[PDB]
Design a protein around this ligand. Structure first.
Ligand SMILES: Nc1ncnc2c1ncn2[C@@H]1O[C@H](COP(=O)(O)OP(=O)(O)O)[C@@H](O)[C@H]1O
Ligand code: BEF
Ligand SMILES: [Mg+2]
Lengths: 392, 44, 387, 53, 98, 183
């Protein structure tokens, strides 16, 4: 397929990143960022006409996705219509031959979430091939589109949007459905920010959440108070709470990642996922949230000869330090690496790197003949039962 | 590598000496062919 | 196969494992127990651990399913609504159903209760009940000698040409939960701590007892035999020079204390010795209750030619179960190759997928004919409702 | 029009999620599955508006 | 050339006259060893008006070429700093003698 | 798995296309508005050899250790300053996970230092397992005789001659129960 024909869509808990037309040398930041939202005019006959704008205030702003989950599947397929049709019309205005070049056959690469149901993705394929009439479709998961950003085989995907946190173990490029645990999102970061900065509002604490002076401790730190600027350009100073706020969610994710990855009967894949902890989402432009999340993981779930007993047998050694040999799995806890060879993504950050691995997957599979990973039109001639035939 | 002597006096396989022993210079193999000119106005 | 999306559920004595036929993984693996949070709140779900991390007063992890593989809390198991909506996110009335312990032919009832559970309680329009040790034999073998060391115990089932040798199906007591009691019992001085407490005991069986279990062992011979042999080996190594493999520390890091719990190799062996020798824990349990002479389930299968049954079983051994994923199968090979050396033990086992092997066998759902298994219509309830 | 752009795009069955009754003939139960739909079985935003820049 | 480790060998004679000088110096140190109780003497039996002196001429021709490599490789033991320039002047006068 | 490791190769392409972008961009920028690049960058590459491979006297031999005693399994061998310095420099090369060339003249204990390599490091680590030593066919048994007299408890596997005698050894030690293969 053509990378100018490639459409990549990531609806997240607030915003939907859309890119049509890859940058094709290094992949770009997803240029379009809609909110994850579509107005629906309930036409009085019960039919629904779907708009991007509040059409005569009979339209209701239906977010198709918050907390990652599809929360209106028909409005999500019509938000796929709203985005897709917009790509078609905008390339019918800007390019106008793209209906033979970019819109002649759009390999629609849609980023899915763990909380999207089976009937959700089947109705997605139905509306995509019958009502969107899209002959070629990947439903790429957000965890795999995170893990292919450096084709990581075993990792932990922590989708911290502003609203929700997924903890998703990936083993052999595949998600454990029984171990995915979604605990709440930068609103839990905002929540302990409000616990620690009571005098502020949601705009001040959210601008702190998108401030450069936002860290977690586990120089901004040597300063007691630091000054960032509000959305209206007002200088706001903050004490040690700019080293805090994320720490409550850090402990919540940390205990949830421990209870996720220590319950595995396979003692070895636990450590390989334990050393590739990935934390993604529009919140995760916060500095130090991933760092103190790792530090709290090492605080809660790192198996070692503990400092009482390792100090005791440091003293037994000074009588070369041996370690009391434990049997448990989480003995090494580490994070994973981000591809620095994308200057568009080096510049525009890796907080939404799910789109980056989606771009890499799109240049892989679509520019390949491999329809083992996308449904063809003839493959629809098993339908969304061929959606079950085109998974990775 | 244990040896009582290095390679031949002309020494072009100083690469192959250093390549099997070290991961140093196997990327640009054609580097030091101009820089092996040291073994082959006597003062200048 | 046929155009179907069946629901594949394995209900073990401790684990409720659920997904569909068109997904080869379960959508969830929650307990077949519940932290009855106390309102009564039958908290199913593994992490919903965290409620039992509160260890709350009134929170009571009762099982739904006892040690026979049959549920004793069926409407709290109707957990089935929790499965289909909070985990599967589908109507059970949409999809067909495959649900997985063998017996002697008497409780062939529970199906009526599943006529309750799939037609009345959930109105699943068709449900297929499969035999779980026969499902483990399926995922492509016709006859087997299935030993499931699950949470319930060592469940031995002979299977000859697909039929169940009903007199020879023997299920032991000593599996996961008795070893939860055992690991809670022996590391009790080292954890310094020493159903309703199932919120203490099941929670510890979720946090550290399993962390001592997936990390327990079985001796490949008898531990008394391996113990005497390794003591003889260490005496040879000591007397020749002037080391025992059993004197080395398998320390456990009890994370509610962050403390070294030095149990040795023989010590971790001794827990799973009670599955083969439960006379070492209580006098009321014979070595026949252990897995070796459980041989007896081969011999009781000899009455269904008995040596042909022995040929089929002892050349078609099948190993499965949660507590069988504790290291040490070679104990089964040694312990039954001394009671039956005549047919060499060519065993089969899922080694991972072993703890959910009944689910994978029920998933094999994906049979190419609806006539290959008995799929119960609502009319099949109506026929079973008559006479 | 959105449907005109859509039919102008990506260039074919339809499929349904329906009760099938399976055959042995038909079983006295029925069940949902994705059955093959046979042959006889809005608005636009302009882009570069939500473009992050 | 690589056959033996002998501490009692004394006298070395070479007829083939070093087609490879590294082959000659490899077989050269088989006489003197740690614990050598004899006194080593080395002879190269070369006839006048023949070609074997030309290889003996080309012996110390080739021995000077690796003299800037392998006899410059000799002070590189403990990363010396002044031992290079001492061997840069002293070995140069021995190369001047020939 | 075919696809996921296809992307591993594709990630190498997107890196190397960026690397062929950037190194060419570096070669354009670093000389527009000799070999001393190989000095500082190969010092850091020695740190890549220590940590990521697993003054030049200091940055490579950073793990410092000097033990002038022979191994206890080295029995009946003469200790001078060469095989003390030859060991603990190579032990410093062993601790830093570095290879090297023992550029010594001759008679400096090539068998003495290698026995003291395996018998000392292994004495502490006690590994002395499937290690490879390959010597020329001219000196095979002399190394093996020195593998008998200068060190016990290190088993040796040879490879010589007609293929009939190898079938007894290499089917018995097919599973690899040895300390050294002397090939
Ligand atoms: N301390 C020592 N005492 C006695 N002999 C020694 C001592 N060190 C080395 N040797 C002699 O050196 C020989 C081994 O040297 P070798 O391994 O052949 O050196 P290389 O391999 O560098 O040529 C032995 O034959 C031994 O007799
Ligand atoms: F290799 Be030399 F003869 F010790
Ligand atoms: Mg030698």
């Amino acid at each position: 397929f053509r990378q100018d024909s490639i459409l990549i869509i990531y609806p997240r808990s607030q915003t939907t990143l859309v890119q049509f037309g890859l940058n094709e040398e290094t992949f770009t930041v997803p240029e379009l960022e809609i909110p994850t939202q579509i107005y629906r005019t309930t036409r009085q006959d019960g039919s629904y006409t779907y708009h991007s704008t509040n059409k005569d205030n009979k339209a209701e702003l239906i977010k198709p996705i918050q907390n990652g989950e599809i929360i209106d599947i028909s409005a999500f397929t019509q938000f796929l219509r709203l985005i897709f049709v917009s790509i078609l019309s905008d390339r019918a205005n800007k390019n106008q031959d793209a209906f033979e070049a970019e819109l002649s056959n759009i390999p629609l690469l849609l980023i899915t979430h763990h909380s999207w149901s089976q009937s959700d993705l089947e109705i997605i394929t139905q509306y995509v091939f019958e009502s969107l009439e899209i002959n070629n479709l990947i439903q790429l998961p957000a965890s795999l589109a995170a893990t292919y950003s450096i084709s990581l085989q075993n990792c932990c995907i922590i989708d911290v949007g502003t609203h929700h946190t997924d903890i998703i173990p990936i083993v052999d490029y595949a998600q454990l459905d029984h171990l995915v645990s979604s605990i709440p999102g930068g609103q839990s970061i905002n929540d302990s920010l409000k616990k620690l900065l009571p005098q502020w509002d949601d705009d001040q604490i959210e601008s702190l959440k998108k401030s450069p002076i936002f860290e977690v401790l586990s120089k901004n730190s040597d300063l007691e108070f630091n000054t960032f600027w509000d959305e209206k350009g007002n200088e706001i100073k903050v004490g040690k709470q700019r080293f805090q706020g994320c720490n409550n969610l850090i402990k919540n994710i940390s205990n949830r990642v421990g209870l996720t990855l220590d319950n595995i009967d396979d003692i070895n894949k636990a450590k390989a996922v334990w050393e590739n902890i990935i934390i993604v989402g529009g919140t995760t432009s916060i500095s130090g949230f991933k760092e103190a999340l790792l530090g709290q993981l090492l605080k809660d779930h790192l198996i070692i000869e503990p400092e009482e007993e390792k100090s005791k047998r440091e003293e037994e050694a000074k009588s070369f330090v041996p370690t009391i040999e434990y049997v448990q799995c989480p003995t090494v806890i580490k994070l994973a690496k981000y591809p620095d060879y994308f200057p568009e993504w080096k510049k525009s950050g890796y907080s939404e790197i799910i789109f980056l691995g989606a771009q890499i997957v799109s240049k892989q599979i679509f520019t390949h003949p491999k329809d083992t990973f996308y449904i063809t039109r003839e493959k629809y001639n098993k339908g969304p039962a061929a959606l079950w035939d085109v998974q990775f | 590598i244990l040896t009582g002597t290095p390679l031949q006096n002309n020494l072009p396989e100083l690469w192959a000496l250093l390549n099997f022993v070290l991961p140093k210079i196997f990327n640009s193999v054609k580097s030091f062919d101009e820089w092996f000119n040291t073994p082959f106005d006597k003062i200048e | 196969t046929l155009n179907r999306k069946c629901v594949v559920i394995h209900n073990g004595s401790h684990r409720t494992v659920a997904g569909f036929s068109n997904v080869e993984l379960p959508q969830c693996i929650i307990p077949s127990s519940y932290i009855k949070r106390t309102e009564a709140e039958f908290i199913f779900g593994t992490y919903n651990i965290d409620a039992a991390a509160e260890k709350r007063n009134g929170d009571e992890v009762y099982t739904l399913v006892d040690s026979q593989g049959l549920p004793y809390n069926w409407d709290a198991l109707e957990q089935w609504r929790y499965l289909y909506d909070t985990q599967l996110k589908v109507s059970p009335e949409e999809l067909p159903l495959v649900i997985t312990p063998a017996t002697n032919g008497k409780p062939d009832a529970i199906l009526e209760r599943y006529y309750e559970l799939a037609f009345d309680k959930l109105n699943v329009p068709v449900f297929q009940i499969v035999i779980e040790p026969l499902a483990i034999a399926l995922s492509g073998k016709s006859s087997a000698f299935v030993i499931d060391i699950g949470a319930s115990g060592c469940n031995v089932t002979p299977i000859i040409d697909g039929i169940v040798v009903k007199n020879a199906v023997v299920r032991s007591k000593f599996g996961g939960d008795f070893l939860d009691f055992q690991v809670h019992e022996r590391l009790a001085p080292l954890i310094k701590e020493e159903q309703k407490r199932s919120t203490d005991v099941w929670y510890e069986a979720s946090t550290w007892i399993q962390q001592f279990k997936s990390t327990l062992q079985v001796s490949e011979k008898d531990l008394f035999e391996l113990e005497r042999y390794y003591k003889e080996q260490a005496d040879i190594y000591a007397k020749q020079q002037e080391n025992n493999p059993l004197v080395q520390k398998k320390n456990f890091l009890f994370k509610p204390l962050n403390k070294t719990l030095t149990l040795d190799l023989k010590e971790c062996y001794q827990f799973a010795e009670y599955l083969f020798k439960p006379q070492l824990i209580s006098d009321k349990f014979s070595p026949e209750d252990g897995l070796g002479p459980l041989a007896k389930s081969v011999k009781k299968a000899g009455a269904s030619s008995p040596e042909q049954v022995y040929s089929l079983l002892l050349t078609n051994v099948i190993i499965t179960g949660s507590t069988s994923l504790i290291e040490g199968e070679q104990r089964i090979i040694k312990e039954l190759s001394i009671r039956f050396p005549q047919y060499k033990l060519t065993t089969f086992a899922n080694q991972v997928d072993r703890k959910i092997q009944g689910w994978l066998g029920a998933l094999t759902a994906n049979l190419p004919s609806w006539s290959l298994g008995k799929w119960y219509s609502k009319e099949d309830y109506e026929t079973l409702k008559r006479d | 029009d959105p449907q005109t752009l859509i039919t102008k795009a990506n260039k074919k069955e339809s499929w349904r999620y329906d009760w099938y009754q399976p055959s042995k003939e038909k079983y006295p139960f029925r069940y949902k599955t994705w059955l093959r739909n046979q042959e006889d079985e809005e608005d636009i935003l302009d882009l570069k508006e939500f473009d992050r820049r | 050339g690589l056959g033996l480790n002998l501490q009692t060998a004394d006298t070395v004679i070479i007829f083939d006259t070093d087609w490879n000088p590294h082959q000659d110096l490899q077989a050269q140190d088989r006489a003197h060893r740690i614990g050598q109780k004899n006194e080593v003497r080395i002879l190269r039996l070369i006839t006048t008006n023949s070609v074997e002196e030309v290889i003996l001429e080309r012996a110390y021709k080739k021995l000077d070429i690796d003299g800037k490599v392998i006899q410059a490789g000799k002070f590189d033991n403990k990363s010396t700093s002044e031992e290079q320039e001492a061997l840069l002047r002293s070995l140069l006068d021995a190369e001047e003698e020939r | 798995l075919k696809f996921g490791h296809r992307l591993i190769a594709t990630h190498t392409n997107l890196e190397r296309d960026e690397q062929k972008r950037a190194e060419k961009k570096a070669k354009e920028r670093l000389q527009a508005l000799l070999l001393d690049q190989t000095k500082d960058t190969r010092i850091t590459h020695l740190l890549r050899q220590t940590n990521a491979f697993l003054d030049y006297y200091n940055v490579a031999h950073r793990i410092k250790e000097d033990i002038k005693k022979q191994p206890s399994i080295l029995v009946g061998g003469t200790l001078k300053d060469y095989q003390i310095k030859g060991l603990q420099w190579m032990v410093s090369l062993f601790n830093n996970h570095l290879n090297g060339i023992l550029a010594d003249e001759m008679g400096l204990g090539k068998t003495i230092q290698t026995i003291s390599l395996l018998t000392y490091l292994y004495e502490m680590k006690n590994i002395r397992g499937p290690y490879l030593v390959i010597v020329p066919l001219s000196t095979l048994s002399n190394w093996s005789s020195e593998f008998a007299k200068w060190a016990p408890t290190l088993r040796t596997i040879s490879f010589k001659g007609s293929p009939n005698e190898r079938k007894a050894k290499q089917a018995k030690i097919r599973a690899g129960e040895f300390d050294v293969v002397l090939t």
